[PDB]
Design a binder for this molecule. Structure first.
Ligand SMILES: O=C(NCCCN1CCN(c2cccc(Cl)c2Cl)CC1)n1c(=O)[nH]c2ccc(-c3cccnc3)cc21
Ligand SMILES: O=C(NCCCN1CCN(c2cccc(Cl)c2Cl)CC1)n1c(=O)[nH]c2ccc(-c3cccnc3)cc21
Lengths: 361, 358
């Protein structure tokens, strides 16, 4: 049930009764107006709306509700609370004319930009994003990956379109969990998740026993794309994607193929040596960024850095400097308020992750 | 290879190349006017002019593994069809720098592709006339019916790999770098075939697929030509599958088992079957929609064979004795079938060869 109405200057106003995303189930009277679509596709429509009272902008994701099982994205969104993940404020059910079908609406934070759009603005003008922003955007993404992985949840669709951005505050928030799923060892999972360009090689090889390290590969493809100005492993087919991976990483040894897809899909690749990673990027590319890419984009999934280990990489040392600031003068967003949940994968890493100045009493 | 010039300042290359569809007696071949016309993954595709007949040719240059023999070459020397690009010659040469051997494939030159022609009508906000949809689709099925009779699967049917001569309306299939003979019992990789056109059993990661993946990809080209845009788009397999469910409906558990037996352990939203007639524009011929529904089937064994598609009622206008091209010329070769081409279903010759043919 929803109650449509108007204000007194015009302005159509919708009022729903929604459940808080987190906390106890205390129903909520939420009124919003100025509804405008901000893109759809597959899952459904994603709207933008303005809250009537406070005037804040929010996003509403409207998908079809399977009457059999409850929506998996909703069960995950309610378990999550992190500064680098888009927050589920409320959620409610509704319809739309007859249909006899139920729609699930997820009221989330609104963030005005995406990494895809920002990287495209710089790419169209023949230039790359300033490295300080690349450090800030990837650190916050690796922080969000270390959080959901602590719960065993794999995003399974890391791409620049799913990385929201506030340009003023440099805050990054991961969004779109319609492909996320808790990965339990011994259980199989579908191999056709994740978008092109960013699929881990074990996904291209059709493996079903993959771990959360596929998110680390996809995040590594985002970092290299921001450095190169174009996707590092493009291709319209899995064969084309693999060729671009062989071009950089080299031919995968037989033991590396076993770690990816143990099924051995029965293919023989051309033998190409290892592209020295320094030749892949621009001349003035920071070598620490090149070092991070090589440690994220590894054939062997267990050899890739964990999200928490990526945050502690030397490429992010500038963010731990006490005098670091955004170019526009403001302070950096919160980068060191780690929780025990966040550090559970490797608590001793807090000796590096939390700089001394972040502990000044 | 011996680089030289003419006498007007043109630069001419002469190599000793082996005829593709011959015994094995190399000749001296000279070409000029070399220009890049394609690149990516495999290598570079050049265009050249034969110094004798002035005939335009395409040279596909790829790197050669010294271990095994290039599988594309071994397939090309076996093929001889009017709707498949012809391997005129092939030769080896150096390049790059680390003493690496390069294989060069001298093929036919066809000036246009289905992708580029369709992209023009899409930009101009119109649809390709159905007569051209008939001619292009028919010749593509004829090419698939040929290679499938050898057990060869193209595994990459897409409009970019469908060359077109606009004046003669001749279609020629090209790009066999993914082609492979599919033998029952042997597994084959599931990461072949380009996006938008991958068969559903490929998205499910099945390794026991048959030649019917080309038929699905063919059906995706037919739907795209009728719509003016891809019918099953998506940057991921989940997105591609959802667009398929919206048209075909939720596949029954029987259809899931026939697609990928492993059952990838996923549950899909229960969407009813979109009426095929509501997918296309109102003026779309019903015979075209009928052919699409018989190509884009969940169960791979339920899809039409390439030969059965050539005999579909959608191509009846092509068998009319008074059909002509919009530019006035006659239709190209459409009925010069061979015994090998019809081996899948010989009784179909009564329909495929109209009474007025030879
Ligand atoms: O996407 C967001 N913001 C984008 C900024 C505004 N842009 C959209 C409108 N526009 C635009 C875009 C393209 C072309 C044109 Cl011509 C135009 Cl005008 C300008 C740019 N989200 C946000 O803020 N909270 C969210 C919560 C969940 C999801 C989400 C997305 C996908 C799947 N599931 C959930 C997305 C957002
Ligand atoms: O592709 C072919 N013809 C079409 C070339 C496409 N364009 C034509 C002209 N043109 C262009 C023209 C006007 C404006 C603009 Cl703006 C432009 Cl760009 C530029 C190019 N092939 C051909 O004739 N024989 C082949 C043999 C093998 C392969 C092949 C391709 C991929 C993998 N393996 C084999 C391709 C051809």
């Amino acid at each position: 049930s929803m109650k449509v109405s108007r204000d007194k200057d015009g302005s159509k106003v919708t009022t729903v009764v929604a459940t808080p995303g987190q906390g106890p189930d205390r129903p909520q009277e939420v009124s919003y107006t100025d509804t405008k679509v901000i893109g759809n596709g597959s899952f459904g429509v994603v709207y933008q709306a303005k809250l009537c009272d406070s005037g804040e902008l929010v996003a509403i994701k409207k998908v079809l509700q399977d009457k059999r099982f409850k929506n998996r994205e909703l069960q995950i969104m309610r378990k999550l609370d992190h500064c680098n993940i888009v927050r589920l404020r409320y959620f409610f059910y509704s319809s739309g004319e007859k249909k006899d079908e139920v729609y699930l609406n997820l009221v989330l934070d609104y963030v005005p930009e995406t990494v895809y759009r920002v990287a495209r603005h710089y790419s169209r003008a023949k230039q790359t994003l300033p490295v300080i922003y690349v450090k800030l955007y990837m650190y916050q993404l690796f922080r969000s990956l270390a959080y959901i992985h602590s719960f065993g949840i794999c995003h399974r669709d890391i791409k620049p379109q799913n990385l929201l951005l506030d340009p003023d505050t440099a805050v990054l928030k991961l969004c779109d969990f319609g492909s996320a799923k808790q990965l339990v060892r011994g259980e199989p999972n579908v191999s056709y998740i994740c978008s092109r360009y960013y699929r881990a090689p074990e996904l291209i090889f059709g493996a079903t026993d993959y771990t959360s390290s596929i998110d680390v590969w996809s995040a590594g493809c985002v970092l290299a794309e921001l450095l190169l100005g174009q996707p590092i492993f493009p291709g319209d087919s899995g064969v084309d994607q693999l060729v671009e991976i062989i071009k950089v990483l080299g031919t995968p040894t037989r033991e590396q193929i076993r770690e990816m897809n143990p099924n051995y899909t029965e293919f023989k690749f051309p033998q190409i040596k290892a592209h020295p990673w320094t030749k892949v990027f621009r001349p003035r590319t920071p070598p620490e960024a090149i070092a991070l890419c090589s440690r994220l984009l590894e054939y062997t999934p267990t050899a890739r850095l964990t999200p928490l280990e990526a945050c502690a990489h030397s490429f992010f040392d500038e963010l731990r400097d006490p005098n670091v600031k955004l170019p526009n003068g403001r302070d950096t967003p919160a980068l060191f308020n780690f929780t025990t949940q966040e550090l559970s994968s490797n608590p001793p890493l807090a000796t590096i992750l939390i700089p001394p100045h972040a502990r000044i009493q």
